[PDB]
Amino acid sequence: EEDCVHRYGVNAFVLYRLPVVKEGMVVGIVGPNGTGKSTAVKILAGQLIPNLCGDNDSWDGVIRAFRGNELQNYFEKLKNGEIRPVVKPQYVDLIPKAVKGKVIELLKKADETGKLEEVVKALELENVLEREIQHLSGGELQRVAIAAALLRNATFYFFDEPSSYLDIRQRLNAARAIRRLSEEGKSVLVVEHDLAVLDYLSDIIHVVYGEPGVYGIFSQPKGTRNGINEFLRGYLKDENVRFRPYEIKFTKTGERVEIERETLVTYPRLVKDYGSFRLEVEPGEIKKGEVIGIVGPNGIGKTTFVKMLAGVEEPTEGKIEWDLTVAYKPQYIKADYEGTVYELLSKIDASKLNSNFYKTELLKPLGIIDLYDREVNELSGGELQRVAIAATLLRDADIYLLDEPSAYLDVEQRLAVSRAIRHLMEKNEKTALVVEHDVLMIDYVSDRLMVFEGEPGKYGRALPPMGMREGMNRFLASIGITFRRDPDTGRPRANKEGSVKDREQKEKGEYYYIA
Numbered sequence: 116e117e118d119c120v121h122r123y124g125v126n127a128f129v130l131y132r133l134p135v136v137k138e139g140m141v142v143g144i145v146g147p148n149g150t151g152k153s154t155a156v157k158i159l160a161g162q163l164i165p166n167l168c169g170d171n172d173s174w175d176g177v178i179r180a181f182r183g184n185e186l187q188n189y190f191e192k193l194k195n196g197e198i199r200p201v202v203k204p205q206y207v208d209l210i211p212k213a214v215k216g217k218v219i220e221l222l223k224k225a226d227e228t229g230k231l232e233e234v235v236k237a238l239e240l241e242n243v244l245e246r247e248i249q250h251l252s253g254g255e256l257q258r259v260a261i262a263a264a265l266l267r268n269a270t271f272y273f274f275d276e277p278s279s280y281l282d283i284r285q286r287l288n289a290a291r292a293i294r295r296l297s298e299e300g301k302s303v304l305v306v307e308h309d310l311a312v313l314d315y316l317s318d319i320i321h322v323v324y325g326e327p328g329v330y331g332i333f334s335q336p337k338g339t340r341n342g343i344n345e346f347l348r349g350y351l352k353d354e355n356v357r358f359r360p361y362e363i364k365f366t367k368t369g370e371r372v373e374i375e376r377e378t379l380v381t382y383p384r385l386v387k388d389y390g391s392f393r394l395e396v397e398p399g400e401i402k403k404g405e406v407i408g409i410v411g412p413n414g415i416g417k418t419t420f421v422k423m424l425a426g427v428e429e430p431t432e433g434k435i436e437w438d439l440t441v442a443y444k445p446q447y448i449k450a451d452y453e454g455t456v457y458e459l460l461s462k463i464d465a466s467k468l469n470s471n472f473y474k475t476e477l478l479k480p481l482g483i484i485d486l487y488d489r490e491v492n493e494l495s496g497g498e499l500q501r502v503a504i505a506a507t508l509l510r511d512a513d514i515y516l517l518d519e520p521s522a523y524l525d526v527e528q529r530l531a532v533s534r535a536i537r538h539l540m541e542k543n544e545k546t547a548l549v550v551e552h553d554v555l556m557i558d559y560v561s562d563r564l565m566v567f568e569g570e571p572g573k574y575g576r577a578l579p580p581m582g583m584r585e586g587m588n589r590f591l592a593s594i595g596i597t598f599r600r601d602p603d604t605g606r607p608r609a610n611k612e613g614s615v616k617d618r619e620q621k622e623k624g625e626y627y628y629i630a
């Protein structure tokens with residue numbers, strides 16, 4: 116194999132092949148972290164001269180090395196400066212330590228297209244313009260970075276993981292704004308871990324596979340549907356590569372309705388006031404042995420609702436009268452345990468750690484066994500997320516509450532967590548409520564849905580748990596995106612704006628198919 120593009124050093128990480136870039140199209144990239152996705156972006160953006168796994172140190176070398184490839188001309192243009200790709204960086208948290216002043220100052224400066232007013236609208240930046248960069252949240256930094264990139268005038272735009280820190284509405288609206296670039300004839304390359312967003316965004320897909328931290332390989336370009344389906348199946352036909360020993364199928368959105376579950380508990384109208392913000396919860400019922408997905412933009416009260424159910428927060432009005440044990444995986448986790456992951460988890464339930472079912476369905480797929488000897492206080496955000504999810508699912512309780520388990524996880528880890536939640540809840544016949552912004556995770560794990568509506572920071576309303584179709588129709592109408600079903604894998608499939616299916620579904624008010 117002589118498709119070696121870059122080696123980080125002796126025994127360091129090596130990248131094989133590169134994705135294609137095409138004007139007028141969106142090329143999506145999907146794969147586990149540590150496999151070279153950002154490295155390819157750096158190379159194509161001109162930020163890193165690939166050494167071709169040798170000593171190459173010039174663009175001329177790359178130009179000769181890519182003879183016979185459509186990228187030869189690309190690199191010629193890159194070296195000559197006829198193109199200067201715009202890059203929305205992955206590590207938006209580092210923006211402050213390099214930029215100062217008001218957001219409106221950063222954006223006016225990036226504005227080379229006179230679309231400031233439009234981009235601000237799309238990314239909900241109206242109240243961030245006057246804010247200083249130093250006071251921005253990870254979420255606001257992400258949206259400001261996507262806006263800066265969208266405002267530039269160039270031919271090539273590369274977005275590295277734009278959905279991180281964005282709520283469900285924000286990530287789908289940013290995807291619409293990003294895709295518009297290709298409609299204007301520009302070329303877009305986007306790396307994404309949220310499969311629904313990746314789907315809606317892309318015309319072409321590359322799957323990246325390999326061994327995290329050791330090597331990564333870009334697949335041949337694939338049509339959007341075929342690429343995402345091969346990814347779920349764990350097997351790339353043409354390349355004849357099986358990167359996962361099993362398939363992840365989504366077929367199972369119908370049986371989760373034909374079964375009369377008993378009621379676990381009911382809760383009455385609840386109100387939680389935080390100064391000027393107010394959350395009103397409509398009376399609801401929770402069934403034994405079901406999973407309720409919870410969706411809604413942020414700053415609306417999802418976490419506040421979960422906290423009241425977990426008993427960590429008290430309602431201002433209304434009273435919950437339960438005699439249930441609850442296991443709770445909080446949205447923001449702070450490691451504070453002097454001991455290893457194994458010590459922490461073995462103290463929760465050692466019998467489950469030694470259980471074949473738990474090792475197969477939870478510990479191995481989430482990579483927990485490989486973290487057993489790690490000190491909890493030294494875990495990264497993604498490692499801590501997996502360990503906290505496992506810690507929560509290892510507890511013995513009537514109800515399990517998981518507040519945003521997909522944050523910090525890569526696409527493969529998300530699929531592993533979706534399966535773990537579903538399989539363990541089915542096994543233990545218990546109940547869970549899961550707040551999530553990742554549509555395919557919601558789809559995979561949920562039997563019913565609770566939708567939150569309101570004005571972020573001002574007021575929120577928790578609608579009672581309803582069917583998947585009714586809840587997604589309610590949420591999606593607010594965003595103008597429709598999903599149908601893909602028979603091959605059973606996954607929800609995004610319709611491009613204006614397509615035949617999109618028009619048909621919108622006219623009928625059926626924004627989300629299951630059947």
Ligand SMILES: Nc1ncnc2c1ncn2[C@@H]1O[C@H](COP(=O)(O)OP(=O)(O)O)[C@@H](O)[C@H]1O
Binds near residue numbers: 148150
């Ligand atoms: N500057 C560097 N020096 C050495 N190794 C690096 C450097 N940048 C990235 N790597 C390593 O290369 C691998 C792939 O990195 P990256 O392209 O950022 O992955 P991803 O698919 O998560 O975006 C990782 O194992 C990473 O630690």
Ligand SMILES: Nc1ncnc2c1ncn2[C@@H]1O[C@H](COP(=O)(O)OP(=O)(O)O)[C@@H](O)[C@H]1O
Binds near residue numbers: 389392418419
């Ligand atoms: N303890 C608190 N004191 C004051 N305001 C709070 C408190 N907890 C949450 N809030 C505010 O309540 C609103 C709802 O927050 P939250 O429930 O975290 O939202 P989300 O839907 O993003 O999980 C936000 O505007 C938040 O700033």
Ligand SMILES: [Mg+2]
Binds near residue numbers: 275
């Ligand atoms: Mg990356």
Ligand SMILES: [Mg+2]
Binds near residue numbers: 417418419446518
């Ligand atoms: Mg929250």
